[PDB]
mmCIF file with all atom_site columns, C-alpha atoms in Angstrom:
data_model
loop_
_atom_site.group_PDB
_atom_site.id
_atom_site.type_symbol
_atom_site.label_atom_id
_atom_site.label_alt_id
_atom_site.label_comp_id
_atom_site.label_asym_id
_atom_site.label_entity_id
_atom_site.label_seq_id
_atom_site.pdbx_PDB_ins_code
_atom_site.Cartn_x
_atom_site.Cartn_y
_atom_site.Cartn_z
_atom_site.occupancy
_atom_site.B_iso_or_equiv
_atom_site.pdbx_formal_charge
_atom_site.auth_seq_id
_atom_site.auth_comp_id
_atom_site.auth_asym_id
_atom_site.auth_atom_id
_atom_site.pdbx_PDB_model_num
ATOM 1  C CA . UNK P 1 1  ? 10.768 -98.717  -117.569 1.00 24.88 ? 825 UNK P CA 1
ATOM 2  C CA . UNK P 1 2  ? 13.250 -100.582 -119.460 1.00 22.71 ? 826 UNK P CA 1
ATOM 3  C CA . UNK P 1 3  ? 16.685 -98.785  -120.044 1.00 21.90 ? 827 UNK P CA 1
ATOM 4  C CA . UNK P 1 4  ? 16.547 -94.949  -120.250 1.00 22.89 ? 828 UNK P CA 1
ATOM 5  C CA . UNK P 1 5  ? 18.893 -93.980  -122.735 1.00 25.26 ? 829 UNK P CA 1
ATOM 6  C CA . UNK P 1 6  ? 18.823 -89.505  -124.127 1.00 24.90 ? 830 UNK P CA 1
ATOM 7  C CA . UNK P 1 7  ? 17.655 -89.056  -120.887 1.00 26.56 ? 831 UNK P CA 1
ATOM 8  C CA . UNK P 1 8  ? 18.694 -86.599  -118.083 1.00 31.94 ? 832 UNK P CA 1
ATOM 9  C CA . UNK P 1 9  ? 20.616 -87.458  -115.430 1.00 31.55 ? 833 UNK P CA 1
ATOM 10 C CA . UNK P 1 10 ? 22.845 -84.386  -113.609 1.00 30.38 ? 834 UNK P CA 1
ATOM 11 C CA . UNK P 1 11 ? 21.505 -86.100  -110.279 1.00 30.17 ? 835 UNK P CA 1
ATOM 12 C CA . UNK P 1 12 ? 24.256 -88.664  -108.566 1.00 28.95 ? 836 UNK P CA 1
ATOM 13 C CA . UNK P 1 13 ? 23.384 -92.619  -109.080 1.00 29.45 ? 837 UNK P CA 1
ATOM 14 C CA . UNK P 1 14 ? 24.240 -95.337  -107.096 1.00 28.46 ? 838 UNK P CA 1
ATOM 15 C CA . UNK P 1 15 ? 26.611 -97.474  -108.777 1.00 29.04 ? 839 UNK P CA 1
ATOM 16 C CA . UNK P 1 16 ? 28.761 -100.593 -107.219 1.00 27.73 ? 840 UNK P CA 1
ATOM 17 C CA . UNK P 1 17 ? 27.865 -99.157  -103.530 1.00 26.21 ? 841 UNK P CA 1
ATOM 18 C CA . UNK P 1 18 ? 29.798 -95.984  -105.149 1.00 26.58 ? 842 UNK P CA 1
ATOM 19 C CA . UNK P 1 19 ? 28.235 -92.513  -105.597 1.00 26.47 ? 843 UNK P CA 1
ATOM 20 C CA . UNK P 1 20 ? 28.805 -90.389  -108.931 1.00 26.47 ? 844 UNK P CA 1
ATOM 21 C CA . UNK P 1 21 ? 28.259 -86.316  -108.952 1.00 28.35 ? 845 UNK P CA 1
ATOM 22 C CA . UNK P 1 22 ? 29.358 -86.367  -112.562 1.00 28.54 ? 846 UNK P CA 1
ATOM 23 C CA . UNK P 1 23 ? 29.564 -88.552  -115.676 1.00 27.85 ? 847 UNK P CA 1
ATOM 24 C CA . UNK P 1 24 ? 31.716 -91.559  -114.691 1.00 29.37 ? 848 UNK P CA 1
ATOM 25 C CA . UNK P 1 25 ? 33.228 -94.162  -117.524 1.00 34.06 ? 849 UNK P CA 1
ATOM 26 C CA . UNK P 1 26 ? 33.054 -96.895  -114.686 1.00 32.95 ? 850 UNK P CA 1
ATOM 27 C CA . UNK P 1 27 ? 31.802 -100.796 -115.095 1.00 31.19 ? 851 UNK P CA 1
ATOM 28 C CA . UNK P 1 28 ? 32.880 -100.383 -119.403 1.00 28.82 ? 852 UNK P CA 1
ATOM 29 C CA . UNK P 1 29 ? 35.839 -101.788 -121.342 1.00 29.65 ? 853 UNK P CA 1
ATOM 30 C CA . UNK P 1 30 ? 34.983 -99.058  -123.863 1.00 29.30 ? 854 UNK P CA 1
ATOM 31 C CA . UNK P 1 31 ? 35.621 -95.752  -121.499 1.00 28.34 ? 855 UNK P CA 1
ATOM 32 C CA . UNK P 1 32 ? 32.395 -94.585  -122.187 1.00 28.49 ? 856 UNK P CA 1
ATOM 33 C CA . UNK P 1 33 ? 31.163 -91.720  -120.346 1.00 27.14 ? 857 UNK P CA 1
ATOM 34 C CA . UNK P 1 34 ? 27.535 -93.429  -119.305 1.00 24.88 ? 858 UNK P CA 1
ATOM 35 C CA . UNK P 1 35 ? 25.107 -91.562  -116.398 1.00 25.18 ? 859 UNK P CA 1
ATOM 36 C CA . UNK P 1 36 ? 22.125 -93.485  -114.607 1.00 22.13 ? 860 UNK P CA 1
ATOM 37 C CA . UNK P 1 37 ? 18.609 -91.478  -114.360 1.00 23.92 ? 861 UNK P CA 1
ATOM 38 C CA . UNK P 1 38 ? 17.560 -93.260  -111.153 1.00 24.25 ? 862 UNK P CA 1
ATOM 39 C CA . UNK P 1 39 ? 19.154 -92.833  -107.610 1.00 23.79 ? 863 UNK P CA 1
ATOM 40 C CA . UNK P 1 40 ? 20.023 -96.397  -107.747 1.00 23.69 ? 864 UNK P CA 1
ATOM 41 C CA . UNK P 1 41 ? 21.188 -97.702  -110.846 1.00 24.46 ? 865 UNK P CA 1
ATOM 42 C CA . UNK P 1 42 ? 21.198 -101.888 -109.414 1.00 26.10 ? 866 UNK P CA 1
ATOM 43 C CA . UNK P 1 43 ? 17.794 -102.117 -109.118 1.00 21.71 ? 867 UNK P CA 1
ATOM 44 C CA . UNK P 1 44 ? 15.868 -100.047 -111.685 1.00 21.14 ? 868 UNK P CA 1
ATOM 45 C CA . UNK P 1 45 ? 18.895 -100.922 -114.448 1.00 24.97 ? 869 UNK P CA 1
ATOM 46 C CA . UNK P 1 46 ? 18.106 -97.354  -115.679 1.00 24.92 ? 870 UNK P CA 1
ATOM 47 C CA . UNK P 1 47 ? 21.362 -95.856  -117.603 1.00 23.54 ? 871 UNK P CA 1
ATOM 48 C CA . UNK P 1 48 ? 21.955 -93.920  -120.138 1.00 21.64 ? 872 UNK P CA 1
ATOM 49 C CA . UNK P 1 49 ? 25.470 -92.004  -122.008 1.00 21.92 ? 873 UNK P CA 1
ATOM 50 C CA . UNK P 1 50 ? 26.513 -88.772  -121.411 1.00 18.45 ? 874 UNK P CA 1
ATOM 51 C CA . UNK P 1 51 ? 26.781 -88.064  -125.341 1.00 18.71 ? 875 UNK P CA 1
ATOM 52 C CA . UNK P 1 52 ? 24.761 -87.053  -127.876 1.00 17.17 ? 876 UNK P CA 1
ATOM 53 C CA . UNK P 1 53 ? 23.113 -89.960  -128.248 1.00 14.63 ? 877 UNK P CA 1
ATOM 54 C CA . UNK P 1 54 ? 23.630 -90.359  -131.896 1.00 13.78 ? 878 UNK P CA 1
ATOM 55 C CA . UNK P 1 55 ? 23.575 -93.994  -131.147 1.00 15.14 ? 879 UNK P CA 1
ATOM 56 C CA . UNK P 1 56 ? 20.266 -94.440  -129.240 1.00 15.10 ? 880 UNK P CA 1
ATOM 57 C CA . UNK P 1 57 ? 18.249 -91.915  -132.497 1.00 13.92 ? 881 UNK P CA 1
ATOM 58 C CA . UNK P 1 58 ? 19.982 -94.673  -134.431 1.00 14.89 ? 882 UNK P CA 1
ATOM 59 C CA . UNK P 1 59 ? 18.541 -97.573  -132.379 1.00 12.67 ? 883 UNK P CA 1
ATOM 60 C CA . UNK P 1 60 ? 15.186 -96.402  -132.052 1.00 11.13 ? 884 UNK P CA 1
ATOM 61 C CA . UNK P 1 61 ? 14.662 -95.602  -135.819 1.00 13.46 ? 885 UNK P CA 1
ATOM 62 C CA . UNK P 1 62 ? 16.131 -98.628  -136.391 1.00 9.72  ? 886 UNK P CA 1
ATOM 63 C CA . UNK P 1 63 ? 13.627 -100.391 -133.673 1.00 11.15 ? 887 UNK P CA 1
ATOM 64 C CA . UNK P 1 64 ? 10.701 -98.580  -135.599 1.00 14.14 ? 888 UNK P CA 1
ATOM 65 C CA . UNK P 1 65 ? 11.935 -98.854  -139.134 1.00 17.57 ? 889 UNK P CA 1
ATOM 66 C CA . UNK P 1 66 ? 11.717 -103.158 -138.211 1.00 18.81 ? 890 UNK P CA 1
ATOM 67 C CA . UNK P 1 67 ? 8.882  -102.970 -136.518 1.00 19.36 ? 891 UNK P CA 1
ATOM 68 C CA . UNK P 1 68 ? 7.180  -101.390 -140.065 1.00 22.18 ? 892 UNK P CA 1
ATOM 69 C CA . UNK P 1 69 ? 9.093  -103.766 -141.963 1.00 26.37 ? 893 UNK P CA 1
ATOM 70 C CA . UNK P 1 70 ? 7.788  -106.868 -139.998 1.00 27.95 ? 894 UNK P CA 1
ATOM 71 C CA . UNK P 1 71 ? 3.782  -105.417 -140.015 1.00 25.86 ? 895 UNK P CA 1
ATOM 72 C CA . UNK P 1 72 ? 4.174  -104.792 -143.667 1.00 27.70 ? 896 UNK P CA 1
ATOM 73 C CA . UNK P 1 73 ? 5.689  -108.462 -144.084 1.00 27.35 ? 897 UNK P CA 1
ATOM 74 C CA . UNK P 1 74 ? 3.128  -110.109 -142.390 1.00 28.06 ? 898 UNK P CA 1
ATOM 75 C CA . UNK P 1 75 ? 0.492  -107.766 -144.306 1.00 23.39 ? 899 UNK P CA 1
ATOM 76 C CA . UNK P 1 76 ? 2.104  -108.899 -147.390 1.00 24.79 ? 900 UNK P CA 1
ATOM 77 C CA . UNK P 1 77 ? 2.256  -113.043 -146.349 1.00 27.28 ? 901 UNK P CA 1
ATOM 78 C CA . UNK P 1 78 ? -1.351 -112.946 -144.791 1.00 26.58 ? 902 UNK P CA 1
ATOM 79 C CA . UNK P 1 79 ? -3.261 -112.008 -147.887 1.00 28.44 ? 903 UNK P CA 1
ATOM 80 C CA . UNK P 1 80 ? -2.807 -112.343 -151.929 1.00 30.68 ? 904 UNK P CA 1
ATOM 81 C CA . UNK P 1 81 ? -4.896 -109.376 -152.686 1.00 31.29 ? 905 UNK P CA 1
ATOM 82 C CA . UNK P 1 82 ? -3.185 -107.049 -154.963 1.00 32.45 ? 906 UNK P CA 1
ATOM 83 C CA . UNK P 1 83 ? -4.155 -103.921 -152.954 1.00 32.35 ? 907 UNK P CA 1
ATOM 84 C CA . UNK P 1 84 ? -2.860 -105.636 -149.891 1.00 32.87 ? 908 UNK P CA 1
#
């Protein structure tokens, strides 16, 4: 399921054998307000912030935007055809 980030998560998580009814900052340098979707947030590893999530839209385009980039690339080094 990898990491679950612009994703709800009102529910409490399980985090450091602590319980959180709300958005907690806890485990970050940064202060962060960060929520976990699962009950238990040590095994699954599913987390995600309590924002807008400005910065996960960014990551994913970005994700897809390199994922293009590298089919075109190899499109482009696998055959000398003009049309390719």
């Amino acid at each position: 399921e990898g990491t679950a980030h612009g994703e709800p998560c009102h529910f409490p998580f399980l985090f450091l054998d602590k319980e959180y009814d709300e958005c907690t900052s806890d485990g970050r340098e940064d202060g962060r307000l960060w929520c976990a979707t699962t009950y238990d947030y040590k095994t699954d590893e599913k987390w995600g912030f309590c924002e807008t999530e400005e910065d996960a839209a960014k990551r994913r385009q970005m994700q897809e935007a390199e994922m293009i980039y590298q089919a075109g690339m190899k499109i482009l080094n696998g055959s000398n055809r003009k049309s390719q």
